[PDB]
Design a protein around this motif. Structure first.
Motif, PDB file in Angstrom:
ATOM      1  N   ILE A  88      31.180  47.378  85.354  1.00 43.83           N
ATOM      2  CA  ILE A  88      30.669  47.731  86.664  1.00 43.83           C
ATOM      3  C   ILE A  88      30.792  49.231  86.944  1.00 43.83           C
ATOM      4  CG2 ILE A  88      30.934  45.452  87.674  1.00 43.83           C
ATOM      5  CD1 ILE A  88      33.424  46.730  89.215  1.00 43.83           C
ATOM      6  N   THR A  89      31.189  50.029  85.953  1.00 45.90           N
ATOM      7  CA  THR A  89      31.367  51.462  86.159  1.00 45.90           C
ATOM      8  C   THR A  89      30.343  52.212  85.343  1.00 45.90           C
ATOM      9  OG1 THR A  89      33.760  51.069  86.402  1.00 45.90           O
ATOM     10  CG2 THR A  89      33.017  53.326  86.319  1.00 45.90           C
ATOM     11  N   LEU A  90      29.426  52.893  86.036  1.00 43.60           N
ATOM     12  CA  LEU A  90      28.471  53.740  85.350  1.00 43.60           C
ATOM     13  C   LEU A  90      29.171  55.005  84.854  1.00 43.60           C
ATOM     14  CD1 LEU A  90      25.550  53.356  87.894  1.00 43.60           C
ATOM     15  CD2 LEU A  90      25.689  52.377  85.596  1.00 43.60           C
ATOM     16  N   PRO A  91      28.671  55.611  83.774  1.00 45.45           N
ATOM     17  CA  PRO A  91      29.150  56.937  83.418  1.00 45.45           C
ATOM     18  C   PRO A  91      28.872  57.893  84.582  1.00 45.45           C
ATOM     19  CG  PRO A  91      27.032  56.496  82.382  1.00 45.45           C
ATOM     20  CD  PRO A  91      27.480  55.197  82.990  1.00 45.45           C
ATOM     21  N   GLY A  92      29.777  58.851  84.777  1.00 50.67           N
ATOM     22  CA  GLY A  92      29.575  59.835  85.825  1.00 50.67           C
ATOM     23  C   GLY A  92      28.296  60.639  85.573  1.00 50.67           C
ATOM     24  N   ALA A  93      27.732  61.144  86.670  1.00 50.35           N
ATOM     25  CA  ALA A  93      26.526  61.953  86.607  1.00 50.35           C
ATOM     26  C   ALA A  93      26.812  63.395  86.998  1.00 50.35           C
ATOM     27  CB  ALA A  93      25.446  61.400  87.528  1.00 50.35           C
ATOM     28  N   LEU A  94      26.213  64.311  86.222  1.00 45.25           N
ATOM     29  CA  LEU A  94      26.196  65.738  86.502  1.00 45.25           C
ATOM     30  C   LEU A  94      24.925  66.032  87.312  1.00 45.25           C
ATOM     31  CD1 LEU A  94      27.289  68.609  86.076  1.00 45.25           C
ATOM     32  CD2 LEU A  94      25.887  68.691  84.007  1.00 45.25           C
ATOM     33  N   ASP A  95      25.101  66.417  88.585  1.00 45.20           N
ATOM     34  CA  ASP A  95      23.981  66.803  89.457  1.00 45.20           C
ATOM     35  C   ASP A  95      23.825  68.314  89.302  1.00 45.20           C
ATOM     36  OD1 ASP A  95      22.404  67.532  91.598  1.00 45.20           O
ATOM     37  OD2 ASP A  95      23.582  66.437  93.104  1.00 45.20           O
TER      38      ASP A  95
END
Length: 208
Positions: A88-95
């Protein structure tokens, strides 16, 4: 396609039971910016998502002139961008997008910007085991990285374009993973599509 959305401390209110009833299945939540900003809303939002059946991840607003990519990956991973293999944990995103305080490319050359992004994504992967998602726009990516293909075979693309179709992708990516298609989520926030089925969303969360 699967619907989802994203929020930050700009949104006072998110009823995640209502969002799940709407059909949304994933959410990205702002965690950090630079090395000094932690969203005061992150914990309420991430907990609410967890408790209401969402797949969820965090995102980091890049400040490429302020500090190294490695320093920002460490700050993000320590303050909401951590990952675990719980389905249920997506990889973090770099904005990584237009400078909100000045010139769009932050004063970096294109090659320096590519190196900064490389430092962030390599560091984030070394900490968490995951390559981060990259959130950007094709026009920003073209001007500020020289339309670099360097990350496409590691980092899923989260492309933003508020239009009837996704439009042209940055160089290297054959497809989007997420598409942010409006800034009009009904409860506040932005709306996203995930380009795949439930099995594939779970595989992205699991990292396999």
């Amino acid at each position: 396609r699967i619907p989802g959305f994203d929020i930050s401390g700009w949104q006072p209110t998110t009823d995640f039971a209502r969002a799940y009833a709407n059909g949304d299945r994933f959410v990205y939540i702002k965690a950090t910016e630079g090395t000094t900003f932690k969203s005061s809303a992150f914990s309420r939002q991430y907990t609410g998502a967890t408790q209401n059946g969402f797949i969820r991840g965090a995102y980091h607003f890049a400040q490429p002139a302020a500090s190294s990519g490695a320093a920002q990956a460490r700050y993000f991973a320590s303050n909401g961008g951590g990952w675990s293999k719980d389905g249920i944990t997506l990889p973090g995103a770099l904005d990584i997008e237009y400078n909100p305080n000045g010139a769009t490319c932050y004063g970096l050359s294109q090659s320096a910007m590519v190196n900064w992004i490389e430092d962030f994504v390599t560091t984030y992967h070394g900490i968490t085991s995951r390559w981060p998602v990259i959130y950007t726009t094709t026009d920003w990516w073209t001007q500020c990285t020289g339309n670099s293909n360097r990350f496409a075979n590691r980092c899923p693309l989260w492309i933003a374009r508020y239009a009837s179709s996704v439009g042209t992708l940055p160089n290297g990516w054959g497809f989007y993973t997420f598409w942010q298609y409006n800034d009009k989520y009904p409860q506040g926030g932005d709306s996203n599509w995930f380009n795949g089925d439930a099995s594939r969303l779970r595989a992205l969360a699991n990292g396999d």
